[PDB]
């Protein structure tokens, strides 16, 4: 577990370093805002239908009455250009807010504990996550358990021992193809089917696919270690 | 040698799982994976 | 999940093949370079929004063609091979029920067409029926369908013997609910009303922008080429800057109404992608989130512009 | 039973506590075993 964990961090270190654009969501927001700022200033080159964008020239060539009739175009133009910037900024900030609510939700549920959410704390079965800072944002290092490797097995819904039908308390009944065992649905670790691994519900009539084997109860051989002890006292009392 | 080749796109290689009313697949090993998720 | 990619060519709507108008539109500098970027950013986001929800699988899972699911009768929800598009009987229902014009508008196709959104929803389903939840969190792994249902039952805390000693009835009441859905979708259309709403918002929004090419905006005349048939150079441009102003406001408002709309569609697709992730790839331990009972499993079918869920509940 | 339940406390504190005589399914499985022994006593007194 530790070697995989230390290799996974050691791979992530190089992966984030190497390829050109892996932080692209943070590139996107530091670009898009800077592009709009640059644009908002560049619009001070436009005439808006006036005689110059350089506003002092509209005092230099035009005077007290008619200069107003130029200027009103530069005002509604510049002010519309600022409205275009603020409306975009309100929208794009709500896109950032709509991330940040997901970020705070993901933070609480993936770092401040263990969400059972599927592919929410990233792909696999979420184990735990670690928060790292970035400029204007967050990176989550999501740690998960992923099923890697497997063998072909057959499963029983239930076991017929007593004609009565037995069921797991946890896990699944499987056969290696000759014998049967009780094992957890996410990882192969067998046991002999006991009364502690299992419970009883009715009998084998109503249920499809149900297989045939005996179930072991440790009482039986434990009390056979007790019947033999008894039988030794019963025989031996013949003698004194 | 290289040119801008165009194609209809693909979603993956064909993988029907060999399902049946008695077959199972239980894992013997697992990866502790790590992934990065970046949020603005 | 997504809108149509309506995009406006910010010159042609303002200036119908006229350089006279285009040179006065250059007197406003870079605005159209940004309005074009604003509608483009919506169009880009529709592909991503379609991908985030449907490309939630990294292989094309498929059923075996023989169908031993214990009376869980999936026949109408899997794709039918005899159909031209490989779509299901639910999808043959859904897909009925929802170039540049002289106005300079344009419309673009999605990155993934209905064959491909169907093959994705078919894999999201086929991993569900062949592999339980597990295709969401590792390699593919076979399991019997009733053992999926057993695990699910134990998951909502009903004991797994309760599945087994009623199976032949359970699967029938499940098929009875599938049957009621096929009849329901054959019987109604207002249920799809949430997909109807997005396209109707876009239909009347397009219709609004079209009507505004007929507005006079205080000018001598409401049509540009009609003015070019009657004025010259100074008493013409005093009219052309106006048409430009009124139409420029039409574009500002059109793109404002669409941008705040594109946030509705993104948020709706983000929720739909979490419900691929958490209803369809999984088993929700959250009350009333997937269906209006204890969740058992969920099955997605492609729709125009969106997805319907069969959210299946105890 | 002793396998459906877990033990706690003593019967004074829990408001709403009813009486009911539980079943310990070990108790007949050691009694079915005690009477097998009782038959070997009822045999061994005879020879
Ligand atoms: C299915 O699972 C069974 C349990 O793992 C397995 O049977 C077991 O086989 C091992 C040897 O491979 C036996 O171990 C004993 O082998 C001999 C017995 O004479 C001794 O030399 C050893 O010291 C050791 O005691 C297990 O006893 C045996 N278990 C049982 C209950 O039979 C099967 O082989 C597996 N099936 C397949 C197809 O592999
Ligand atoms: C699962 O195990 C069951 C118990 O061993 C088994 O059923 C048993 O099958 C035998 C052999 O056919 C029956 O033996 C006699 O049954 C009737 C009389 O009652 C006769 O018609 C037969 O000719 C034969 O003499 C057992 O009675 C029967 N026991 C029970 C409890 O059903 C199943 O066949 C096994 N199934 C599988 C697929 O492993
Ligand atoms: C639940 O069952 C309990 C056990 O029988 C029972 O408790 C018993 O209550 C009676 C009456 O208070 C006690 O009777 C004795 O009380 C004193 C001695 O302690 C004497 O003066 C009396 O003559 C009489 O012997 C029992 O001793 C007491 N037993 C225990 C173990 O607490 C509850 O009353 C029952 N409650 C219900 C609602 O059924
Ligand atoms: C697990 O088994 C599957 C298929 O099941 C077996 O199929 C027959 C060959 C026969 O042995 C049956 O009794 C079994 O039920 C394996 O799937 C095969 O994978 C290979 C590539 O490795 C592919 O070329 C074949 O077409 C597949 N065969 C089928 C029928 O699907 C699978 O690889 C096995 N995996 C492990 C790790 O054991
Ligand atoms: C799980 O798989 C890992 C590899 O990802 C196994 O670890 C390797 O085991 C081989 C020997 O079988 C060694 O040569 C390698 O050096 C090991 N690598 C590491 C990272 O330890 C591991 O043994 C498997 N575990 C189980 C229980 O199957
Ligand atoms: C599963 O359900 C469908 C109905 O939704 C069944 O399809 C019908 O089957 C019969 C026999 O082939 C035909 O006469 C009907 O016309 C079919 N209807 C449709 C819409 O295909 C299907 O047979 C059922 N299968 C099982 C095993 O019950
Ligand atoms: C234990 C059991 O009955 N298994 C059945 C088998 O009988 C049947 O032939 C098969 C059909 O595919 O489905 C499974
Ligand atoms: C209002 C009411 O009915 N309160 C009940 C009471 O009747 C009952 O006798 C008691 C037993 O635990 O529990 C409480
Ligand atoms: C039999 O029991 C006697 C005591 O009654 C004891 O001394 C003796 O060791 C026992 N012998 C055997 C064979 O168990
Ligand atoms: C005593 O035990 C033997 C077997 O060891 C048996 O034959 C006999 O019937 C028994 N006698 C009694 C009285 O039960």
Swiss-Prot record, chain D:
Glycans are attached at residues 19, 43. Subunit of the fusion protein that is processed upon entry into the host cell. Mediates fusion of the virion and cellular membranes by functioning as a class I viral fusion protein. Contains a viral fusion peptide that is unmasked after S2 cleavage. This cleavage can occur at the cell membrane by host TMPRSS2 or during endocytosis by host CSTL. In either case, this triggers an extensive and irreversible conformational change that leads to fusion of the viral envelope with the cellular cytoplasmic membrane, releasing viral genomic RNA into the host cell cytoplasm. This is Spike protein S2'. It comes from Severe acute respiratory syndrome coronavirus 2 (2019-nCoV). The gene is S.
């Amino acid at each position: 577990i530790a070697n995989q964990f230390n290799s996974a961090i050691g791979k992530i270190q190089d992966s984030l370093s190497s390829t050109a654009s892996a932080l692209g969501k943070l590139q996107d927001v530091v670009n898009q805002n800077a592009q709009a700022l640059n644009t908002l200033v560049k619009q001070l080159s436009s005439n808006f239908g006036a005689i110059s964008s350089v506003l002092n020239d509209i005092l230099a060539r035009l005077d007290k009455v008619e200069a107003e009739v130029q200027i009103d175009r530069l005002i509604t133009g510049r002010l519309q250009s600022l409205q275009t910037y603020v409306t975009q900024q309100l929208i794009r900030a709500a896109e950032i807010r709509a991330s940040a609510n997901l970020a705070a939700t993901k933070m609480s549920e993936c770092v401040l504990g263990q969400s059972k959410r599927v592919d929410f704390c990233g792909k696999g079965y979420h184990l735990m996550s670690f928060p790292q800072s970035a400029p204007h944002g967050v990176v989550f290092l999501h740690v998960t358990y992923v099923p890697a490797q497997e063998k072909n097995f057959t499963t029983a819904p239930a076991i017929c021992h007593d004609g009565k039908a037995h069921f797991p308390r946890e896990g699944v009944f499987v056969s290696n193809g000759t014998h049967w065992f009780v094992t957890q649905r996410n990882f192969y670790e067998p046991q002999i089917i006991t009364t502690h691994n299992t419970f009883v519900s009715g009998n084998c009539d109503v249920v499809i696919g149900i297989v045939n084997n005996t179930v072991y109860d440790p009482l039986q051989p434990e009390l056979d270690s007790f019947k033999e002890e008894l039988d030794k006292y019963f025989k031996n009392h013949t003698s004194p | 040698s290289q040119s801008i080749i165009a194609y209809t796109m693909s979603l993956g290689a064909e993988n029907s799982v060999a399902y049946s009313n008695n077959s199972i697949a239980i894992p013997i090993n697992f990866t502790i994976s790590v992934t990065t998720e970046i949020l603005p | 999940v997504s809108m149509t990619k309506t995009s406006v060519d910010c010159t042609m709507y303002i200036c119908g093949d006229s350089t006279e108008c285009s040179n006065l539109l250059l007197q406003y500098g870079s605005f159209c370079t940004q309005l074009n970027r604003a509608l483009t950013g919506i169009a880009v986001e529709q592909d991503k929004n379609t991908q985030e929800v449907f490309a939630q699988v990294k292989q094309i899972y498929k059923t075996p063609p023989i169908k031993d699911f214990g009376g869980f009768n999936f026949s109408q929800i899997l794709p039918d091979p005899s159909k031209p598009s490989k779509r299901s009987f639910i999808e043959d229902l859904l897909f009925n029920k929802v170039a540049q014009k002289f106005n300079g508008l344009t419309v673009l196709p999605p990155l993934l067409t209905d064959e491909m959104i169907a093959q994705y929803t078919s894999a999201l389903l086929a991993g569900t029926i062949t592999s339980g939840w597990t295709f969401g969190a590792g390699a593919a792994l076979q399991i019997p369908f009733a053992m999926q249902m057993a695990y699910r039952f134990n998951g909502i805390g009903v004991t797994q013997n309760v599945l087994y000693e009623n199976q032949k009835l359970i699967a029938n009441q499940f098929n009875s609910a599938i049957g009621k859905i096929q009849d329901s979708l054959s019987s109604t259309a207002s249920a799809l009303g949430k997909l109807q709403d997005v396209v109707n918002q876009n239909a009347q929004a397009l219709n609004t922008l079209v009507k505004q090419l007929s507005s006079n905006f205080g000018a001598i005349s409401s049509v540009l080429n009609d003015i070019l048939a009657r004025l010259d150079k100074v008493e013409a441009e005093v009219q052309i800057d106006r048409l430009i102003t009124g139409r420029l406001q039409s574009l500002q408002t059109y793109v404002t109404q669409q941008l705040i709309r594109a946030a509705e569609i993104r948020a709706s697709a983000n929720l739909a992608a979490t419900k691929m992730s958490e209803c369809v790839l999984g088993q929700s331990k959250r009350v009333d989130f997937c269906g209006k009972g204890y969740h058992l499993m969920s099955f997605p079918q492609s729709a125009p512009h969106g997805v319907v869920f069969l959210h299946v509940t105890y």
